[PDB]
């Protein structure tokens, strides 16, 4: 909470996670992802989702909620892949220049379109 009131929220989430917190860590991490998705930082959105995925699987170490957390793990992993993919497309259609090779954008776009048929995660 010292980092939190000091606005060091990334480190704060890391702290709660390392501190056995499983109510503060998840809530602050979801809030951070929502902030990242709100802006154009889709790559950070993907990385935070990835952290959620592995942390939630760690929480699923508890046999009580194994069934109701493997689902969350799989869902967040898929979201992580999708957003890290979509970051390149977001950059490509905004900057006056281009960074990636055409082959890579082609492959990314095809994978996205064949993994996002009818439901669009926020921002995509």
């Amino acid at each position: 909470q010292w980092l939190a009131e000091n606005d060091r929220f990334e480190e704060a989430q890391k702290a709660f996670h390392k501190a056995g917190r499983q109510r503060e860590a998840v809530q602050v991490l979801e809030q951070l992802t929502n902030n990242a998705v709100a802006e154009s930082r889709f790559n950070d959105a993907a990385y935070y989702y990835w952290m959620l995925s592995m942390q939630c699987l760690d929480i699923a170490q508890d046999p009580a909620q194994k069934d109701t957390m493997l689902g969350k793990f799989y869902h967040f992993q898929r979201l992580a892949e999708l957003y890290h993919g979509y970051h390149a497309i977001h950059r490509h259609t905004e900057d006056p220049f281009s960074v990636h090779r055409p082959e890579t954008l082609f492959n990314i776009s095809r994978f996205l379109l064949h993994s996002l048929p009818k439901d669009t995660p926020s921002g995509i």
Binding site: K118, T120, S122, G123
Partner: protein
């Protein structure tokens, strides 16, 4: 026909013939489908021939060599408006709205400072699928329950689905249904009907799309008729409404049939509710129905039976028989 050359103007094209210049305006993206709309007219000095249009200036050659300029009547907002008056700005606002010139419309509304003028601009901006600029307008109007809604559906990319949403926000539900049934997620039209409380169309749309809503929307429609007053078609729907998983829902439909038919002449066919009642709650609701139709028959019965059992004393004071009242006198909390 000279198309509009100015970069920011989408699709305007004055046609022109002899002593007139019309100001047609294409409309690619609207809720009601695409169409072409006349915006106005003008007049051209005799012996002239248009060559170019740009922001409204119809560079037109004369019958001698010199290119005179004209000003379209339809595009008159270009100049300042301190000279213009409210009675002069209002039609100017309408013209700018037709031309899809939203920036000038915003400027002129800011000058006018009329709430209804801003509201008209907002309705136009919804009508043309301009979600962002409509949000900008509403955020100034102050209307909050629509700012949040529009910010909610700003993500939608599907053309017909977005069309249906922006239709619903313009309180045209029929066209909303029409578009939603063409979008990727038709069940949204269902959701609209079910929220909008028109359960008959809810059944129609659901049956074609979802079968899970069928018994539950049937139950809701039956209850709608029951609170309204009908109790025959309501009972029939209740029969239709019985599911096989939600014992709550199931016995609820059973109680429905019980009460609606009991209101009908069914002391024999609502006589089931003497038995069909699966909860003391059901019994006491039947006690309400058995103070409903001037019962001795089964005011007597359900106040002798139900958790409303002391009530049999009044159910039987209605009658002569004192067995119930006297025997219940120990089993009563109202001396």
């Amino acid at each position: 026909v000279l198309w509009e050359n100015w970069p920011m103007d989408k699709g305007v094209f004055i046609a022109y013939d002899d002593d007139k210049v019309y100001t047609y305006v294409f409309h690619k993206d609207t809720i009601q489908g695409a169409k072409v709309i006349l915006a106005g007219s003008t007049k051209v000095p005799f012996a002239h021939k248009p060559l170019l249009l740009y922001n409204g200036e119809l560079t037109c050659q004369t019958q001698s060599g010199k290119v005179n300029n004209i000003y379209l009547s339809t595009h008159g907002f270009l100049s300042n408006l301190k000279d213009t008056g409210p009675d002069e700005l209002r039609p100017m606002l309408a013209q700018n709205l037709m031309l899809k010139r939203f920036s000038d419309a915003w400027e002129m509304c800011r000058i006018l400072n009329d709430e209804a003028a801003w509201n008209e601009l907002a309705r136009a901006c919804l009508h043309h699928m301009e979600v962002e600029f409509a949000i900008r307008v509403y955020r100034r109007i102050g209307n909050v329950g629509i700012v949040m809604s529009l910010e909610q559906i700003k993500g939608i990319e599907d053309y017909n689905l977005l069309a249906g949403h922006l239709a619903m926000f313009t309180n045209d539900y029929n066209l909303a249904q029409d578009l939603y049934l063409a979008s990727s997620c038709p069940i949204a039209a269902l959701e609209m009907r079910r929220d909008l409380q028109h359960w008959d169309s809810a059944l129609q749309l659901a049956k074609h799309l979802a079968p899970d809503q069928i018994p539950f929307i049937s139950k809701e429609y039956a209850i709608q008729l029951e609170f309204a007053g009908d109790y025959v078609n309501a009972l029939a729907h209740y029969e239709k409404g019985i599911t096989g998983d939600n014992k709550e829902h199931d016995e609820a439909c059973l109680a429905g049939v019980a009460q609606m038919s009991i209101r009908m002449g069914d002391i024999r066919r609502g006589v089931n509710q003497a038995l069909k009642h699966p909860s003391r709650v059901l019994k006491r609701d039947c006690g309400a129905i058995l103070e409903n139709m001037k019962q001795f028959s089964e005011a007597a019965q359900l106040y002798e039976k139900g958790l409303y059992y002391d009530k049999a004393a009044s159910v039987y004071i209605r009658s002569k028989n004192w067995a119930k009242v006297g025997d219940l006198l120990p089993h009563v909390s109202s001396p």
